[PDB]
């Protein structure tokens, strides 16, 4: 009994029983709305910028204030030249500090703005909220949106009316509404919005069926069975495939020409390029966190770093003794890992030519890799006699978990976005779901045919998984089945079939949509 | 305990270094 052995071992061992980010975010939100609102929304840009700049100057971070001034000067250089030159103490600053800015706005617009700011409180909206409360005052009104040809402006101009308190107080609406052509309770409004919003959450799941998803397929022709690896960029704009002829080829997924930073290649017209320099079959490729860098490994025992701006190699890493089978960037793109024939896992940083960590403990070759979403753990799997999965710590380099149970060659590994689940597949068609903290198997999924499952992907919320196999199918699984209201496992939501195209890659986008890739063989 | 490590670590290290030579 293993429990007796473990208890004896433990007993014998004495075990006792800042502001620029906010401005950019606000500008990006502003240009996304309808063109009607934008006219009133643009009025918030200048007060926020000036008050942020003055606060940074006062706090003593004159360097940051100078950086902000120079960075954003081009945006306002065509409106407020004199003010910017002055900003290069005078009574202007005192007057600005004494009198708080007055900005008219509509009630519905105010509600939308407050909801948006609350939705991103921790991302940078708190800074804008505080600035608006302290150095600004909003005079909300029930009028319609103000535009040069909207109902309100046309009515005011035609009927020869008079300005209001909000309109009274260097662009001023007086120049528009004149013939020459309320306050706010922020803080209270914020708690109030939070209370209203908290009432519309979903906290259960009973009955029903799984989620429906769409799929787009990219097929490669005339390959003649020489393609070994595939990969999409993080934004689904480029596709790279490695071959058995030692070269790599990158395409534009929309057919648009690719661009090179070299002046001699100015405005050249090509939508696919080649990366040459390996002397052996390429087995792995990885796009960096648009992507500017690429990693590749081959059977000659080398790892190469390429540049997607000039399309040339930059460095070579020579730490392995034998073929290298897999290479992977870190979750954020400065660290990467590799593993191959010599039964060792190595972790690199792009700034150093030697591996910073070496991980021993496997008894056979490695056949899969995966990173943890937090960037401090790595997963690996071996084949043959030793079919086990291991979790290593990057800080110490030691193993912390082992998962056992697989009886076939392991082909794919994947970690959930929440960071608490792990998925793995083998050539027997099985898919395992592991609990990382307890090191226990949760359940098994079945339905795929024999041959291998090269890839796996997790939904955005980690509630749906999609897989692709060499049996020419794409399948969707439900991690947790709905609560009952009182050959294939009953948690397979869907299953699609391809026209003689083994699937080498599946990817989940932001929506309930996926992109797949494969090679078509008529025979 | 006598000669607790956290306070006398440097002296023990120095004597050990002398011993190793």
């Amino acid at each position: 009994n293993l429990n007796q052995i473990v208890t004896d071992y433990l007993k014998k061992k004495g075990f006792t029983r800042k502001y620029l980010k906010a401005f950019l975010l606000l500008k990006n939100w502003i240009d996304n709305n309808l063109d009607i609102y934008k006219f009133e929304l643009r009025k918030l840009l200048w007060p926020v910028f000036v008050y942020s700049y003055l606060e940074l100057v006062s706090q003593g971070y004159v360097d940051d204030a100078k950086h902000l001034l120079e960075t954003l000067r081009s945006h306002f250089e065509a409106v407020h030249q004199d003010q910017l030159a002055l900003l290069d103490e005078n009574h202007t600053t005192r007057l600005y500090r004494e009198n708080k800015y007055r900005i008219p706005l509509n009630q519905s617009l105010s509600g939308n703005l407050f909801h948006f700011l609350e939705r991103e409180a921790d991302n940078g909206g708190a800074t804008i909220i505080y600035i608006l409360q302290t150095h600004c005052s909003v005079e909300t009104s029930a009028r319609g949106p103000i535009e040069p040809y909207s109902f309100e402006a046309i009515y005011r101009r035609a009927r020869n009316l008079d300005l209001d308190e909000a309109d009274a107080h260097g662009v001023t609406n007086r120049d528009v509404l004149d013939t020459s052509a309320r306050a706010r309770d922020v803080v209270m409004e914020m708690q109030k919005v939070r209370e209203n919003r908290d009432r519309f959450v979903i906290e259960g799941r009973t009955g029903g069926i799984g989620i429906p998803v769409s799929a787009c397929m990219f097929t490669f022709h005339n390959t003649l069975g020489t393609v070994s690896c595939m990969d999409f960029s993080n934004d689904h704009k480029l596709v790279a495939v490695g071959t058995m002829d030692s070269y790599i080829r990158v395409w534009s997924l929309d057919g648009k020409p690719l661009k090179s930073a070299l002046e001699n290649e100015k405005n050249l017209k090509v939508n696919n390029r080649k990366l040459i320099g390996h002397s052996g079959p390429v087995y792995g490729v990885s796009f960096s966190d648009s992507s500017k860098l690429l990693l590749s490994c081959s059977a000659d025992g080398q790892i190469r770093l390429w540049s997607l701006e000039i399309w040339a190699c930059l460095c070579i890493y020579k730490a392995h003794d034998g073929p290298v089978f897999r290479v992977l960037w870190g979750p954020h793109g400065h660290y990467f890992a590799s593993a191959g024939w010599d039964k060792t896992v190595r972790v690199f940083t792009q700034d150093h030519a030697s591996a910073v960590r070496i991980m021993v403990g496997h008894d056979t070759s490695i056949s899969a890799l995966a990173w943890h979403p937090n960037g401090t753990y790595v997963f690996s799997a071996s084949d043959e006699m030793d079919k086990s999965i291991r979790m290593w710590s990057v800080i110490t380099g030691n193993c912390v978990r082992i998962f056992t149970g697989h009886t076939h060659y392991i082909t794919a590994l994947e970690c959930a976005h929440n960071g608490k689940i792990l998925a793995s597949a083998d050539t027997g068609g099985n898919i395992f779901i592991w609990d990382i903290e307890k090191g226990t198997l949760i359940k098994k999924c079945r339905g795929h045919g024999k041959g291998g499952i090269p890839s796996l992907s997790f939904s955005a919320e980690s509630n749906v998984l999609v897989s692709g196999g060499l049996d020419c199918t794409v399948r969707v699984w439900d991690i947790e089945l709905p609560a009952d209201p009182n050959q294939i496992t009953p948690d397979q939501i869907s299953a699609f079939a391809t026209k003689k195209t083994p699937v080498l890659k599946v990817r989940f986008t932001r929506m309930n949509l996926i992109v797949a890739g494969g090679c078509y063989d008529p025979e | 305990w006598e000669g607790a490590e956290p306070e006398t670590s440097d002296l023990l290290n120095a004597v050990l270094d002398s011993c190793l030579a």
Partner: protein, 114 residues
């Protein structure tokens, strides 16, 4: 002799290996094609290959000729059919194996598989 003058004269020393084969095998070995690599270098590499093959061919012919005029072929060089026609010299597995044995290659096979 100088490398500069030899490369300049490379116009007159082009080998018989087509440029397509050169480009294919350069790409396999990890070198971009002539448009990005001076054509003279590719021609030089192809000429070296031609010289190597010609040396092996001469060695094989010398081995074949001394044999021409006990009298049983050496084991491990299985191959052939009726035995050719007329008194023509035939490039056979035995002579090629004997020649390439001097270059570090082993081409031993089985004669009958059973």
């Amino acid at each position: 002799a100088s490398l500069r003058e030899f490369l300049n004269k490379m116009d007159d020393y082009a080998p018989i290996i087509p440029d397509a084969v050169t480009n294919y095998y350069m790409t396999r070995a990890g070198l971009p094609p002539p448009p990005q690599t001076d054509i003279r270098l590719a021609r030089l590499l192809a000429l070296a290959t031609q010289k190597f093959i010609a040396d092996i061919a001469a060695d094989a012919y010398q081995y074949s000729r001394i044999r021409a005029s006990l009298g049983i072929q050496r084991p491990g060089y299985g191959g052939g059919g009726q035995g050719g026609s007329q008194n023509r010299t035939v490039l056979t597995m035995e002579d090629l194996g004997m020649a390439v044995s001097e270059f570090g290659v082993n081409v031993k096979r089985s004669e009958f598989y059973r």
